[PDB]
Amino acid sequence: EEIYAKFVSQKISKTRWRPLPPGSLQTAETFATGSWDNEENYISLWSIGDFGNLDSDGGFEGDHQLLCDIRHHGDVMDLQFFDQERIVAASSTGCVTVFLHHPNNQTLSVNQQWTTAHYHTGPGSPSYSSAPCTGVVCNNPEIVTVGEDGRINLFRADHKEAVRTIDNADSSTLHAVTFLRTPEILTVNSIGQLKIWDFRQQGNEPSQILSLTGDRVPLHCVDRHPNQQHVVATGGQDGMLSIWDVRQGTMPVSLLKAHEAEMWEVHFHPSNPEHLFTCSEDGSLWHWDASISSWLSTDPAKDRIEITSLLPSRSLSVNTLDVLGPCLVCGTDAEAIYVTRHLFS
């Protein structure tokens, strides 16, 4: 069906759905966003407007209603839900912040904050320099983050300090991070590599490394298939999409062109994961259907992936997406958000 765009008069760097109650029969009712490149950046909670109704006096109540906000510090580099009331966000300040929604009040608050999670160092004094925190992933009650400092941190939603830190896991920027298994993560970098880390190991060095062959394509985003802990998808500086089986050598299994630019997020569908979605600095947003899991076929001219642009035009950059049941949302540099309640009609 048609897609309900909204201007919000801030650039949106990140969007996320509110996690549904286990065993409910609701659609995705609420989403959260984070902003970037303002004089003031914010994190906001929104409801999807109800296009089903008019009352006697003819008003269009079908707007994506703002529930509540809170002001941020720096740019909102990455964003994720932690439970059904708490959210975690990264920052250009190297800060990591946990927030709490108050349904009885319609407000946000801070819940906990790590103001120096990421920082660059220098010769012999604790006059640290700000390092952008680039990505965040949650495994409640646990949390992991990456940054320009090449640091990996492990944090906890009951603890104030770091549970573990790993400085200089790269000499370049680390961009994004995901959990393969609860003590076992994967990160991506400025070189064009996937680095795998096990918090059980007492060294700081990586448990495994994967790459492209020689020429450097920085990898900006990563996801890992919901019912295959060994299948990983990454997005390049060029607009390539790479599918990996982390058990089978050092290279991707499947290599596809997705954009004419930097690909900013990639996601498998949380219930339908033979479906995939991607956004980019080429101004486009795409759906991919492929229904061995079809993502691991070495000949996409035999086995299918059938591919749809969800936007009817190209905008200023699409930084982010999220998809939950039939609902999809994306966020842009055109100071705007796009939402559908239905992706299968």
Region from 58-66, 153-161, 187-195, 251-259 binding another protein, contact rule CB under 8 A? 187-195
* Residue nearer to another protein on the CB measure, 4 or 128: 128
User: Cβ of residue 272: shortest distance to another protein, in angstroms?
Assistant: 30
User: Cβ of residue 261: shortest distance to another protein, in angstroms?
Assistant: 7
Region from 26-34, 61-69, 129-137, 249-257 binding another protein, contact rule CB under 8 A? 129-137
Rule CB under 8 A: is residue 235 a binding residue for another protein? Answer: no
Rule CB under 8 A: is residue 122 a binding residue for another protein? Answer: yes
Please tell me the distance from the alpha carbon of residue 155 to that of residue 147, in angstroms, as a whole number: 14
Reduce the DSSP state of residue 247 to 3 states and report it: coil
Reduce the DSSP state of residue 153 to 3 states and report it: strand
Rule CB under 8 A: is residue 172 a binding residue for another protein? Answer: yes
Dihedral class, residue 283 (left if φ above 0, else alpha if ψ from -120 to 50, else beta): left
Rule CB under 8 A: is residue 78 a binding residue for another protein? Answer: no
CA angle 75, 81, 84 (to 5 degrees): 140
Please tell me the distance from the alpha carbon of residue 9 to that of residue 164, in angstroms, as a whole number: 39
Q: How many CA atoms lie within 13 A of 121 on its CB side?
A: 11
User: Cβ of residue 94: shortest distance to another protein, in angstroms?
Assistant: 11
Rule CB under 8 A: is residue 261 a binding residue for another protein? Answer: yes
Please tell me the distance from the alpha carbon of residue 34 to that of residue 41, in angstroms, as a whole number: 8
AA identity, residue 267:
H
- Among 92, 97, 242, 320, interactor with another protein by CB under 8 A: 92
* Residue nearer to another protein on the CB measure, 146 or 231: 146
Output phi, psi for 194, to 5 deg: -110, 120
Rule CB under 8 A: is residue 216 a binding residue for another protein? Answer: yes
> How is 306-326 classified by DSSP, letter by letter?
EEEESSSS--S-EEEEEEETT
Question: How many residues sit in the footprint of another protein (CB under 8 A)?
Answer: 47
Q: Which of 152, 142, 145 is nearest to 82 (CA)?
A: 142
- Among 2, 22, 39, 56, interactor with another protein by CB under 8 A: 39
Please tell me the distance from the alpha carbon of residue 66 to that of residue 249, in angstroms, as a whole number: 48
- Among 142, 148, 245, 265, interactor with another protein by CB under 8 A: 148
* Residue nearer to another protein on the CB measure, 92 or 340: 92
Rule CB under 8 A: is residue 281 a binding residue for another protein? Answer: yes
For the beta carbon of residue 309, count every other beta carbon within 10 angstroms: 11
Residue with tokens 């902003």: 35
* Residue nearer to another protein on the CB measure, 198 or 274: 198
Structure tokens at 207: 């448990």
- Among 56, 127, 313, 345, interactor with another protein by CB under 8 A: 127
- Among 10, 44, 134, 178, interactor with another protein by CB under 8 A: 134
User: Cβ of residue 169: shortest distance to another protein, in angstroms?
Assistant: 11
Rule CB under 8 A: is residue 273 a binding residue for another protein? Answer: no
Rule CB under 8 A: is residue 41 a binding residue for another protein? Answer: yes
For the beta carbon of residue 333, count every other beta carbon within 10 angstroms: 17
Rule CB under 8 A: is residue 153 a binding residue for another protein? Answer: no
CA 252, 258, 263, 268: dihedral to nearest 10 degrees?
-70
- The separation between the first and the last C-alpha atoms of the chain, rounded to the nearest angstrom, is 5
Rule CB under 8 A: is residue 9 a binding residue for another protein? Answer: no
Interface with another protein (CB under 8 A): 37, 39-41, 73-75, 77, 92-93, 120-129, 131-132, 134, 148-150, 168, 170-173, 175, 190-193, 209, 211, 214-216, 220, 237, 261-262, 281, 317
